[PDB]
Amino acid sequence: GSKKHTGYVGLKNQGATCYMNSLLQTLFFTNQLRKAVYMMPTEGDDSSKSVPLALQRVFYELQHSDKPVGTKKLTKSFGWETLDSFMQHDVQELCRVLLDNVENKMKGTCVEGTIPKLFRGKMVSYIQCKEVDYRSDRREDYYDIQLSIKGKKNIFESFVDYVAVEQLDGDNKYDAGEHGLQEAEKGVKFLTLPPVLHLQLMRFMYDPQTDQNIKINDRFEFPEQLPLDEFLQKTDPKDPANYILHAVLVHSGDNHGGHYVVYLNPKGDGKWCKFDDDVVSRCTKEEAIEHNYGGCTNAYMLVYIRESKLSEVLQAVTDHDIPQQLVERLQEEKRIEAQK
Ligand SMILES: [Br-]
């Protein structure tokens, strides 16, 4: 009775979908994304082709069902029906496939641009020659950050490594065009961080020593409250880059196989639940955070929310926020299913 115990319902365990159920709940409790998802015009869409419609159905069922929620129409919609599709991708790639479809269908509607407003940050990637006066600056958008964890104690050391300067010398000098091969230094700088911050922790890497993918179970620490102002080029006095832990996506075991689980405090109030496929239960703040540091269970992905955006991002979602037309289609679909 996980609806009774926590107010929330889980997702069925109906295939080797790995990180997918963890990711789906993470997006579901991004309330502003969920509300915008309900506003996509999918009335004319096909019921077995539309990723827009199928994520609406998942979100609607997660919001209304008392029983665990299936995902078969979702996985058929984006075309990942074998484990080979999930082994060949990681969680940030599935997140991009889901949000890209969702962003495109919002073009031309009243919620257009919801995906970049929530997940998009801006960075600058540069190469600077030392002996000649050349610099190449590349402004880039990002929707997620991949952070290395080997040889780093915590998130702060990972961000330090992320923004560090790489020296281009010797057999890896820089091609500076009319200047020939030049010694140079290369780095990235953050200009903005988005309201919802998706950080992947690189525990799954390719081993160069073998021809086998490995998992790094080393200890790596992350805080409930993460201050990131000092990694911005310019800080805002009225909006410091202080971030609040929302979600901890966890794996235990080997790279092949293993158990996938997500921890969340949906309201951002530090009251945590464990979402283990069809079973949702209350848990302590220590089980969600400290007990996933490593040293079996450990975190491979974190979601933070900017403190000034927390009330907006986690805005309340009523049944009235689902348009009555969408409700009628989904309840008609379920009435067709109920006759099955
Ligand atoms: Br299903």
Author numbering: 206 to 500, 510 to 554
The article reads:
In recent years, the cysteine protease ubiquitin‐specific protease 7 (USP7), also known as herpes‐associated ubiquitin‐specific protease (HAUSP), has become one of the most extensively studied deubiquitinases. This is mainly due to its role in tumorigenesis‐associated signaling pathways and its interaction with the tumor suppressor p53 and the oncogenic ubiquitin E3 ligase murine double minute (MDM2). Herein, after a design based on molecular docking experiments, we report the synthesis of a series of mildly electrophilic compounds that covalently modify the catalytic cysteine 223 in USP7 through a nucleophilic aromatic substitution (SNAr) reaction.
Finally, a co‐crystal structure revealed that the prototype compound (7a) arylates the catalytic cysteine in the apo form of USP7 via an unconventional binding mode near the catalytic triad. The electron density of the new bond at Cys223 is clearly visible, whereas no additional density at any other cysteines or amino acids could be observed. As expected, the compound reacted in an SNAr reaction with the fluorine atom being displaced. The structure confirmed that the catalytic cysteine is modified in the inactive state of USP7, where it is less nucleophilic due to the disassembly of the catalytic triad. Compound 7a generally shows an unconventional binding mode compared with all crystal structures, currently published in the PDB. It reaches deep into the region where the catalytic triad amino acids His464 and Asp481 are located. Other published compounds are all oriented in the other direction of the ubiquitin binding channel. However, the exact binding mode must be interpreted with caution as compound 7a is close to crystal contacts. The omit map of compound 7a is shown in Figure 11A,B. The binding mode determined experimentally is closer to the ubiquitin site than the docking pose, with less extension into the pocket near the catalytic aspartate and histidine.
